[PDB]
Amino acid sequence: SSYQIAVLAGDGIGPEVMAEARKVLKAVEARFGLNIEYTEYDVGGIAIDNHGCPLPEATLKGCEAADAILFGSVGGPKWEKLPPNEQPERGALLPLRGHFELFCNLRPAKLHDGLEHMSPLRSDISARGFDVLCVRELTGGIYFGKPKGRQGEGESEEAFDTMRYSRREISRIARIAFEAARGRRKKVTSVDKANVLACSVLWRQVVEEVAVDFPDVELEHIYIDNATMQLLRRPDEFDVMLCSNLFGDILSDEIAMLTGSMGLLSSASMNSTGFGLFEPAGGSAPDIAGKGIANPIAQILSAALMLRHSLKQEEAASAIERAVTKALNSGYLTGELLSSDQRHKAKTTVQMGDFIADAVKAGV
Amino acid sequence: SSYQIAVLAGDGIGPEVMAEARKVLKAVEARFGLNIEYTEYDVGGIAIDNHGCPLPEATLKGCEAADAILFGSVGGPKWEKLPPNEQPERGALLPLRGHFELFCNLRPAKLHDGLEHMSPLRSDISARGFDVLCVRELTGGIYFGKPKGRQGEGESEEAFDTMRYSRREISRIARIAFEAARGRRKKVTSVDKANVLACSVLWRQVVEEVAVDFPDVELEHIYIDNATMQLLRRPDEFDVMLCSNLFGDILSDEIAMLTGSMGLLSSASMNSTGFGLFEPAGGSAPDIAGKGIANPIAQILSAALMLRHSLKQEEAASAIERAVTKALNSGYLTGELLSSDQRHKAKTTVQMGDFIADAVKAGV
Ligand SMILES: CC(C)[C@H](C(=O)O)[C@@H](O)C(=O)O
Ligand SMILES: CC(C)[C@H](C(=O)O)[C@@H](O)C(=O)O
Ligand SMILES: [Cl-]
Ligand SMILES: [Cl-]
Ligand SMILES: [Mg+2]
Ligand SMILES: [Mg+2]
């Protein structure tokens, strides 16, 4: 039958970049004969304005009826001063991930050929390139651990959060990292704080247990503070980084900025049945919203990750990825990927979606 | 009477760099007429080899009798496979900080004039310079929170750690950050994860309460994942970063590597009475130990931080800092601060201590 997609564009540049993702999806649908139906639902700030909360019931129900969630971006200055639970990002993303048991977050990041110069690394380091996939555990640890809250009053008032992990939780995400490494350059770097946290001692121990199934894959451990330093000095030496929830949050953001190319980066957050939520790694960028400036590549590659991981349409997924490579090596760059002099050559959001869709059609 | 210093050189390059710190201290003692007595105690790997644990009773007692701890570095491959509690770093540093209530960690980091090129940042970013002081809360949060440990067996075996903070704990470290900002460029950036952690919601709230005493100081908040990105793009825009224990651990390491000059960086860990532990930010570097290669500046500036903060000898502290500036701008650089061609000009550990001590003597 038809695949069914819940489309949650959100705030800021979400809707403009989502339009280009749908345009390129239309081209892949025609080329590969896929029957996909999409339904739109509010989420984040637009949900608070239209429904009074950032994750309305009808949106949640819409996502339960779908094969995957194609997600834009949430948040903006309008809602930033609401109580923390009522804000767009916390209010949408944490309950979506908990409800759908999206324990696996994949954040691929690489320096693209020809854009090594946009990286904030020293030129000799960025010239060496990098390609680092972060596999982050997304529904356990300190994010969802209990007890969480506060007690007391005044000076003695105290807050608490609890980080918890079981062997089962560590081994499921570790298996994903090792299998991904096997398909890459055969190295997992597991990131913990095993000199301080009991959860990191168990993490390190269980990763070593899972390693026995993968004697072809190199395993190393690195402390999270050290990892922030080593990714500056030798990012070319990492392949897959295997991280708990909070450490994956932190390290995947540093690796993303090290690319200098945030508008190219996508994320996949999956459960064990292969349902997932696919979104750009970057923000809502409300300052450039509605201008046709925004880079729609991250949203377009989020659609390719959705085709691969939720829809089992690998040919359609890679055809999108190649059309994006074609745009980047064929003079089709948005403003933020151009050196400040070459800027007159910037393409708009729709010029980029048109070129990438036409490339899919032309059989790239 | 005499000040009394407990000298804990540790492992690796600790003893060679400590010798240069004592040499420069002898020169400051003569120039400023300070009467200081030093006693040496084992700590870390050398304590495990000599005493069977990394923090012997006699060493702990020695530190209780002192005005401050002048600390080298602990750890090395020899002890890296011991059980986590028995290892040099965890086994020495966590109990020292807990026992002496060293709640305040200060990690000053800047790009030195003329060495902006050693930074791993893109040349146009490092040319802009930076000077970022990290104030890290060191005895609370998840490091010392209870309950901590594990329960269960097999797949359901689970570990847990608890992050806790009280208003009292947040406000003492926040006051330090604001006072330090007042003496600098009047900006505090408080780093939290207030969209996820109850402790970060209380952190953010209490920092805003303390802010009312400092209307001259700008306050901003930044999420820890965002902070790892912003320090790559605009490190010149930060002055004081105010961090909880785990987030300070992580961010101070990224800022240290961004200098490209780890061998110049020192740390101070203080309690409310002004007693503290002063150490280099870098590792034991056991590969270069005993060679006269190691940069002793970080150990020497740790002695200057000790003079200022524990001994209330500001003139002696700044005379050391200026002698270090003189060495750096007068052609006295260790091997790791030289571009690979200029390397023949490297100075040894003792050449550097001799030059810095002679500069103190000459009245720099
Ligand atoms: C918005 C926040 C709760 C979230 C996280 O901490 O996972 C975000 O930082 C992310 O990385 O997707
Ligand atoms: C050794 C470890 C317990 C320690 C910490 O986590 O504080 C270290 O990383 C540091 O930064 O001083
Ligand atoms: Cl976690
Ligand atoms: Cl903490
Ligand atoms: Mg994040
Ligand atoms: Mg550290």
Chain B closest-CA separation from residue A314 CA (Å): 31
* B253 labelled catalytic: yes
Element (H, E) at B144: none
Residues in chain B: 364
| Angle in degrees, CA B33, B105, B203, rounded to 5 | 145
Amino acid at B296: P
Q: What distance in angstroms lies between residue B264's CA and the mean position of ligand 2's atoms?
A: 18
Q: Any binding-site annotation on A253?
A: yes
Does B89 contact ligand 2 (Cβ within 6 A)? yes
Q: Which residues of A are catalytic?
A: 143, 193, 225, 249, 253
Chain A closest-CA separation from residue B358 CA (Å): 34
From A60, A204, A173, select the one nearest A106 (Cα to Cα).
Answer: A173
Which chain B positions have a beta carbon within 8 Å of A157's beta carbon? Answer: 166-167, 202
User: Is the CB of residue A54 less than 8 Å from the CB of residue A86?
Assistant: yes
- Look up residue B121 and give its two tokens: 């940042």
Residue B16's alpha-carbon distances to B20, B21, B26, B75, B182, in angstroms, are 7, 9, 16, 15, 37
What contacts B46, CB < 8 A, 6 or more positions away?
Answer: B9, B10, B11
Which chain A positions have a beta carbon within 8 Å of B254's beta carbon? Answer: 228-229, 232, 254
Resolution of the experimental model, in Å, one decimal: 1.6
Q: Please name which ligand lies nearest the alpha carbon of A96.
A: 1
In three-state secondary structure terms, B309 is helix
Chain B closest-CA separation from residue A297 CA (Å): 20
Which chain B positions have a beta carbon within 8 Å of A203's beta carbon? Answer: 159
Residues in chain A: 364
Does A314 contact ligand 2 (Cβ within 6 A)? no
From A227, A216, A206, A209, select the one nearest A184 (Cα to Cα).
Answer: A216
Atom of ligand 1 nearest to the CA of A246: 6
- List A134's β-bridge partners, or say none: A107, A241
CB distance A160–B152 less than 8 Å? Answer: no
Which chain A positions have a beta carbon within 8 Å of B198's beta carbon? Answer: 148-150, 159-161
Q: Any binding-site annotation on A87?
A: yes
Does A151 contact ligand 2 (Cβ within 6 A)? no
The pick from A43, A55, A71, A93 for probing ligand 1's pocket by mutation, whose C-beta has the most ligand atoms within 8 angstroms, reads A93
Amino acid at A179: E
Element (H, E) at B5: strand B3-10
Which chain B positions have a beta carbon within 8 Å of A159's beta carbon? Answer: 164-166, 197-199, 201-203
- Give chain B's domains with CATH numbers: 1-364 (3.40.718.10)
Cis peptide before B147 (omega within 30 of 0): yes
- Phi/psi-derived region of residue A159, left when phi > 0, alpha when psi is between -120 and 50, beta in every other case: beta
| CA–CA distance, A323 with A20 (Å, rounded to integer) | 13
What contacts B27, CB < 8 A, 6 or more positions away?
Answer: B357, B358, B360, B361
CA dihedral A200, A202, A206, A208 (to 10 degrees): 60
| CA–CA distance, A283 with B57 (Å, rounded to integer) | 53
User: Is the CB of residue B301 less than 8 Å from the CB of residue B320?
Assistant: yes
Q: Any binding-site annotation on A341?
A: no
Parallel, antiparallel, or unpaired: how do β-strands B240-243 and B131-137 relate? parallel
| CA–CA distance, B320 with B315 (Å, rounded to integer) | 9
User: Is the CB of residue B65 less than 8 Å from the CB of residue B4?
Assistant: yes
| CA–CA distance, B143 with B321 (Å, rounded to integer) | 32
Q: Any binding-site annotation on A66?
A: no
Residue A48's alpha-carbon distances to A44, A60, A88, B84, B283, in angstroms, are 6, 14, 8, 48, 50
Chain A closest-CA separation from residue B109 CA (Å): 14
Q: What distance in angstroms lies between residue B162's CA and the mean position of ligand 4's atoms?
A: 9
Q: Any binding-site annotation on A203?
A: no
CB distance A84–B201 less than 8 Å? Answer: yes
By C-alpha distance, the chain B residue nearest A118 is B122
* Nearest Cα residue to atom 11 of ligand 2: B249
Q: In whole angstroms, what separates CA A18 from the centre of its chain? A: 15
CA dihedral B61, B65, B70, B75 (to 10 degrees): 0
Does B93 contact ligand 2 (Cβ within 6 A)? yes
Does A195 contact ligand 2 (Cβ within 6 A)? yes
CB distance A156–B168 less than 8 Å? Answer: yes
The dihedral sign for the CA sequence B347, B351, B355, B356? positive
Please name the residue that has the structure tokens 């061998």. Answer: B263
Q: Which of B143, B192, B332, B347 is catalytic?
A: B143
CA dihedral B165, B171, B172, B176 (to 10 degrees): 120
User: Is the CB of residue A188 less than 8 Å from the CB of residue A217?
Assistant: yes
The pick from B148, B163, B243, B249 for probing ligand 2's pocket by mutation, whose C-beta has the most ligand atoms within 8 angstroms, reads B249
Q: Where are the alpha helices (DSSP H) in chain B?
A: 14-32, 45-51, 57-64, 88-99, 123-126, 167-182, 198-211, 224-233, 245-259, 297-309, 314-329, 349-361
Please name the residue that has the structure tokens 């972060």. Answer: A134
From B278, B225, B284, select the one nearest B78 (Cα to Cα).
Answer: B284
Which chain B positions have a beta carbon within 8 Å of A160's beta carbon? Answer: 145, 162-164, 198-199
CB distance A159–B199 less than 8 Å? Answer: yes
| CA–CA distance, B54 with B5 (Å, rounded to integer) | 19
Q: What distance in angstroms lies between residue B103's CA and the mean position of ligand 1's atoms?
A: 29
Parallel, antiparallel, or unpaired: how do β-strands B149-151 and B158-166 relate? antiparallel
SS (H, E, C) chain A: CCEEEEEEEECCCHHHHHHHHHHHHHHHHHHHCCCEEEEECCCCHHHHHHHCCCCCHHHHHHHHCCCEEEEEECCCHHHCCCCHHHCHHHHHHHHHHHHCCCCEEEEEEECCCCCHHHCCECHHHHCCCCEEEEEEECCCECCCCCCCEEECCHHHCEEEEEEEEEHHHHHHHHHHHHHHHHCCCCEEEEEECCCCCHHHHHHHHHHHHHHCCCCCCEEEEEEHHHHHHHHHHCHHHCCEEEECHHHHHHHHHHHHHHHCCHHHCEEEEECCCCCEEEEECCCCCCCCCCCCCCCCHHHHHHHHHHHHHCCCCHHHHHHHHHHHHHHHHCCCCCHHHCCCCHHHHCCCHHHHHHHHHHHHHCCC
Q: What distance in angstroms lies between residue B18's CA and the mean position of ligand 5's atoms?
A: 41
CB distance A84–B194 less than 8 Å? Answer: yes
Q: What distance in angstroms lies between residue B251's CA and the mean position of ligand 6's atoms?
A: 9
| CA–CA distance, B358 with A302 (Å, rounded to integer) | 62
